[PDB]
Design a protein around this ligand. Structure first.
Ligand code: 0PK
Ligand code: CA
Ligand code: CA
Ligand code: CA
Ligand code: CA
Ligand code: ZN
Length: 316
């Protein structure tokens, strides 16, 4: 859409009011011209055909319940672009300011969200297991981070490389949640999962076992479902990342925490410079150690905490 940049206001899925970047050309569109080559949000109209219609509104006010998921997908995608730019100096997911596209109201009662190799897609959930998925900033950032991975390491979505792919998305979705300071935590999906149960989440990084995910390599899932447990074994890496940042004793192994910022710097460097499509857990360990070495020196405490954290989860 070619038009005049302006700012509209709406309410998100959680009932929170926010300003969003729109474009005016007869209607007001969910097109933010301020970030890279733009951020664009589409209405999939309960169908599965993508992307759907660029979101158009008559008055630049998005307070209807139908508007909620589009407001949050549009606004959180803005925050995520900013995190990447400001913190890691990366311009959009491809590093060359590629337009970011998202479709909301995808299918009927669809309990998931994904990156399809071209855009982000969000279901509205069925109202019980999930509310519309774009209402969680860790969710939006998890999705966008799959694009990041797609353009850098390219980790294949199966087995070990696939669980690394998922962990990276959980790690960066969490870093983005802390960056926006939106009630942050080490839980995934808490804001949009089981609206009727408080205190739970989809996955836990601090304690993956809490929901039955492995927190040690010896407890790795070897089966075939979930692409070989991409969403299951990611708990072993999530726990490792949580220990590097926060510290703790796990299975008798003590880890001094080095904090979140350094965790983000070490992981980003591993992702962009050392990981490949078929990298496994042991290779992730070498990649993380080498990044911390690059950045802080072989004799750093940073390097020391990365080795302990992997030794704690039984990776090497
Ligand atoms: C953060 C949470 C809310 C959403 C997140 N979705 P997700 O981001 O893990 C979504 C899962 C999926 C896979 C295939 C089809 C459709 C959906 N996968 C996805 O987007 O995969 C990225 C990918 C890119 C290229 C090739 C292959 C894969 C998730 O953990 N989903 C769990 C519930 C699951 O799918 O098992
Ligand atoms: Ca309106
Ligand atoms: Ca939170
Ligand atoms: Ca969270
Ligand atoms: Ca819940
Ligand atoms: Zn994922």
């Amino acid at each position: 859409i070619t038009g005049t940049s302006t700012v509209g206001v709406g309410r998100g899925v959680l009932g929170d009011q926010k300003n969003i970047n729109t474009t005016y050309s007869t209607y007001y569109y969910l097109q933010d011209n301020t970030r890279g080559d733009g951020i664009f949000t589409y209405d999939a109209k309960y169908r599965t055909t993508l992307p759907g219609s660029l979101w158009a509104d008559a008055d630049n006010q998005f307070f209807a319940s139908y508007d909620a998921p589009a407001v949050d997908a549009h606004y959180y995608a803005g925050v995520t672009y900013d995190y990447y730019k400001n913190v890691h100096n990366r311009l959009s997911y491809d590093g060359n300011n590629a337009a970011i596209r998202s479709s909301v109201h995808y299918s009927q009662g669809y309990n998931n969200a994904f990156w399809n190799g071209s855009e982000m897609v969000y279901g509205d959930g069925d109202g019980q297991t999930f509310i519309p998925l774009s209402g969680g900033i860790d969710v939006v950032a998890h999705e966008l981070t799959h694009a990041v991975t797609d353009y850098t390491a390219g980790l294949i979505y199966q087995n070990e490389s696939g669980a690394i792919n998922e962990a990276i998305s959980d790690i960066f979705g969490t870093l983005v949640e802390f960056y926006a300071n939106k009630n942050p935590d080490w839980e995934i999906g808490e804001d949009v999962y089981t609206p009727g149960i408080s205190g739970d989440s989809l996955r836990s990084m601090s304690d993956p076992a809490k929901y039955g995910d492995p927190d040690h390599y010896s407890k790795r899932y070897t089966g075939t479902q979930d692409n070989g447990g991409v969403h299951i074994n990611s708990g072993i890496i999530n726990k490792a990342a949580y220990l590097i940042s926060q510290g703790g004793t796990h299975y008798g192994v003590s880890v001094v925490g080095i904090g979140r910022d350094k965790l983000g710097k070490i992981f980003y460097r591993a992702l962009t410079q050392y990981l490949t499509p078929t990298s496994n857990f042991s290779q992730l360990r070498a990649a993380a150690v080498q990044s911390a070495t690059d950045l802080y020196g072989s004799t750093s405490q940073e390097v020391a905490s990365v080795k302990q954290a992997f030794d704690a989860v039984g990776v090497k």
